[PDB]
Design a binder for this molecule. Sequence first.
Ligand SMILES: [Mg+2]
Ligand SMILES: [Mg+2]
Lengths: 320, 320
Amino acid sequence: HMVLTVTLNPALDREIFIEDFQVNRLYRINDLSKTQMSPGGKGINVSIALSKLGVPSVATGFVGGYMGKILVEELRKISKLITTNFVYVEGETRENIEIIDEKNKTITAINFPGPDVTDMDVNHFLRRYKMTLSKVDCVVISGSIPPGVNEGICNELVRLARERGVFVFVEQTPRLLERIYEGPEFPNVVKPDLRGNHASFLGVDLKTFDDYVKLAEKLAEKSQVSVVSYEVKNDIVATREGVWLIRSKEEIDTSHLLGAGDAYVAGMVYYFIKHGANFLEMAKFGFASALAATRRKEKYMPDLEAIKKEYDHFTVERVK
Amino acid sequence: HMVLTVTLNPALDREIFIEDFQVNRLYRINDLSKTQMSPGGKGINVSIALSKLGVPSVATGFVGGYMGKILVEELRKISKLITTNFVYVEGETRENIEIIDEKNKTITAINFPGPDVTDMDVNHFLRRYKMTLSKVDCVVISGSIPPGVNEGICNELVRLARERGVFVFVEQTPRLLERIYEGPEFPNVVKPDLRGNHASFLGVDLKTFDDYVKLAEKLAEKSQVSVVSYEVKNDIVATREGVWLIRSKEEIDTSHLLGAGDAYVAGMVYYFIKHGANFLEMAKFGFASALAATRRKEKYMPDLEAIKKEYDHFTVERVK
Ligand SMILES: [Mg+2]
Ligand SMILES: [Mg+2]
């Protein structure tokens, strides 16, 4: 059983933990927190998450320069369950800085652009993407898209994947999803990234609960399952059969959220592989996994133990 | 003439320029000109500074890991005038982060501690330090110590230099300078780093102009010249002939301050090398460079043209 992840714009994450972080002060970090940098980007975090649950993946995307070397060398060190298969480009993989304040519950994030990618790079990627598709049972396409690349590319990735009988998971922003839902093929599972969204989506402006439901329903028309976030700690789940709402029983630590959403997707993938296409339970195991991730301030991908213990910390209501 | 700079705790400085920087928000730096990355650490910046003025130096200290490699290579690209002679350690050279908000005049700075250095590493360093001293006419020892290094090392470094008739400049925090002013030999030129200081220093609690003057005088008992900062944009210069006060004629931009103090020291080193040991004029030229360094938001080590331009913008008063 094998998974392919696509991370077209990966990052080296630099997580810095400062309580009571404020503008205009010098902070001396304590002698034991060393200058460190971890592999990141959504698909790559999904790979890490899957490796923690014992599930192998091929991780692909674009990587470049010296930062690139670091990402690749570090990613390989995490587990032999992850085989790296990136397309190498000129220019550096982006560093991203996340300043996490566990006392005041804030994340201050600074994101850098990513490399300028070209048509030959995208060509090579498409060749290799097609090769790997033959070896895998499902694909996770998620995250941002680097400068240079046509925004229609994920449509081609979804299209190639579905035409080949490969089950597709997609987590992207509305602007990018609008582009996937044009094309003739569609994700099996879609989880929109609504972080900091103020934009309309599929001709739905998202103010009331009925709007979010109606958005989940629109996606459930062409995809088999939509998981749509609502008031930070809840997810609306829509399939052909009906609509559910998964709710955390407690408030979540908003500063602990880095990569929780990627633990969500990894869970859904894990469930799919181990137990098949029972969509609601997939969504649930993903939610349990996202919650476990929020129990630590770091970008933390939970293990099976940690995920299972979250099963008593949420409820599921049937909406329709 | 040829200078040795010692930077036991080098850094890569990542400068990020964000107008209206506030906490708990995501920033996307699209413009590649709103970030800057460069070799840093006080002695390394002095080497860069001296290079702009045509004075060569050997730069020594500890470097390590991925960040270490970047530092050395970047440093070598800055000028043929800088020779590196660093002991390579296991562990990462620190990357510090400075966020500069030019609109609201703010620097939010995050300083990482640096790698653990072992006792074998420190010995290899001392052994190379001794060798370089016969090749040089003066030495600059500035900035912090990395973890695992005894705070007495700075005393040994001054002592070794001084026994061999090498002229010594030091810029370090009180705690480290206390350790230097123990030992049998003393710096020729001392410029204490008082940033963020709350402790008493040589028996003086720094709360009034007279305290800062008493401190300059105590240091001037054992060193030929002391340069002590007062209210951000002034410096008390004490020699055996008396005490002066150099003041900026105008308010400086406190957000443009990164690395200004190393420009100060570099100017003094240059003046010493070129026009001899006239101390007040050394401090004045140092002050000019410091001012020049502040004229840009980026870490900028000035050239001679930019330094001379500042002779207009400060006064000297005689205190005693
Ligand atoms: Mg977490
Ligand atoms: Mg500056």
